[PDB]
């Protein structure tokens, strides 16, 4: 079974349904862009992101960065972007772990918390896009996830979203539509020895990161943020296990350490883990309380009873006779654990059977240009490490020296750090 039922071509004619010109709810004006609905609640916009941040509206030019204002400007590039992103969703979905994450993402509808009257339930407009219909008029469509190209810095990938004036949607349990800046057209080099990979002065990047991992990393953030359980970026770990990090004063957010998982997540101590678990449990209780107060729905597209069921399913709430919702602590702890401990970069690596950075606490080595679209280069099932070839063994497909036709090095980062 496939996650993406249509193998879209960029030049396929608009239909106003799953191939359409759209606008996103950014502050300020934008012209519509052509977008593709690859799955319920998930769209792909094959454009550079000059839209989500007002201060990031152009594509001109930090050690680890890469600029090219012309990338993703042509139709062929946008066709290959769509096929590349589609192939990576399929690679993710082909694993049991990735099917679980993607199900959680689709179920993670952003909360209808836009009403200021507590007897009324209402959508928040920034968790929608506006879609041009065949008659030229717009309709509003709710969605959970948008994959978009990077902004000026091509290799700055990130899972971001529109705020609310008052509510912290990624941290209050509500969730918000997530926009992931991502490219399948580049990847990163890392070193197979830990002591080299974590040293800013050594290594040229012999192995290449499988872009499925990189996309999964951003999807794990999107899961946190859709469930409104992201850890505030101002909660950070003062790294004290890397002499180079300490000289630079480099701190790493708890949200990143969680997302990576493995040993990195254990830098968050038990007291703090318990603190966050209680904090978000209290948010889920607030959501149950809010749903119980709501006696009407705003709008005509969905019934109150349907939307109450959507959020019962999202938050795994208990519903008694009255139809009253409560949060069961065991079910909360289970879902919270799933989202935060089961869906991790380290666990994806195990499912994909790839070589990868061993820690988030490293130094990048290089950026490579790649093309994952041709099945002779990369597959859903095997990534670069093609079965029944010289590339199947020992991660030889990720070995940029052995599989050199698959990688062109664009830039070295070793030595550029101030060390």
């Amino acid at each position: 079974m496939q996650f993406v039922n249509k193998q879209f071509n960029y030049k396929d004619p608009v239909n106003g349904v799953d191939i359409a010109y759209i606008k996103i709810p950014n502050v300020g004006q934008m012209q519509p862009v052509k977008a593709f609905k690859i799955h319920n609640k998930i769209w792909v916009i094959p454009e550079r992101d000059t839209f989500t941040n007002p201060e990031e509206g152009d594509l001109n030019p930090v050690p680890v960065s890469y600029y090219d204002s012309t990338y993703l400007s042509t139709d062929n590039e946008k066709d290959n972007y769509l096929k590349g992103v589609t192939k990576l969703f399929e690679r993710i979905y082909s694993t049991d772990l990735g099917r679980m994450l993607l199900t959680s993402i689709v179920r993670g509808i952003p909360f209808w918390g836009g009403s200021t009257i507590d007897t009324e339930l209402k959508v928040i407009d920034t968790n929608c896009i506006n879609v041009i219909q065949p008659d030229g008029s717009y309709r509003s469509e709710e969605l959970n996830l948008v994959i978009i190209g990077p902004s000026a810095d091509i290799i700055q990938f990130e899972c971001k979203s529109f705020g609310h004036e008052v509510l912290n949607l990624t941290r209050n349990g509500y969730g918000s539509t997530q926009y992931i800046r991502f490219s399948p057209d580049f990847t990163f080099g890392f070193e197979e020895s830990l002591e080299v990979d974590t040293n800013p002065l050594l290594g040229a990047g012999k192995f290449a990161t499988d872009p499925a991992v990189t996309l999964a990393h951003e999807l794990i953030h999107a899961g946190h943020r859709l469930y409104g359980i992201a850890i505030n970026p101002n909660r950070v770990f003062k790294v004290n296990t890397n002499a180079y990090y300490e000289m630079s004063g480099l701190e790493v957010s708890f949200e990143e350490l969680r997302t990576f998982g493995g040993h990195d997540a254990k830098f968050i101590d038990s007291l703090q883990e318990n603190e966050f678990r209680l904090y978000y449990y209290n948010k889920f209780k607030d959501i149950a309380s809010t749903l119980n107060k709501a006696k009407s729905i705003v709008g005509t597209t969905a019934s109150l009873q349907y939307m109450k069921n959507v959020f019962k399913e999202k938050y795994l709430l208990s519903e008694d006779t009255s139809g009253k919702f409560s949060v069961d602590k065991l079910k909360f702890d289970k879902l919270y654990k799933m989202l935060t401990e089961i869906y991790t970069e380290d666990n994806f690596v195990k499912f994909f059977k790839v070589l990868n950075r061993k820690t988030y606490l490293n130094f990048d080595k290089a950026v490579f240009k790649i093309n994952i679209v041709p099945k002779v280069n990369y597959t859903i099932y095997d990534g670069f490490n093609l079965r029944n070839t010289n590339l199947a063994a020992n991660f030889n497909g990720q070995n940029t020296e052995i599989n050199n036709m698959n990688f062109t090095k664009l830039k070295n980062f070793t030595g550029l750090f101030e060390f």
Binding site: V252, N362, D364
Partner: peptide
Amino acid sequence: CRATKML
């Protein structure tokens, strides 16, 4: 996504 973004 990388830690050195914060430098």
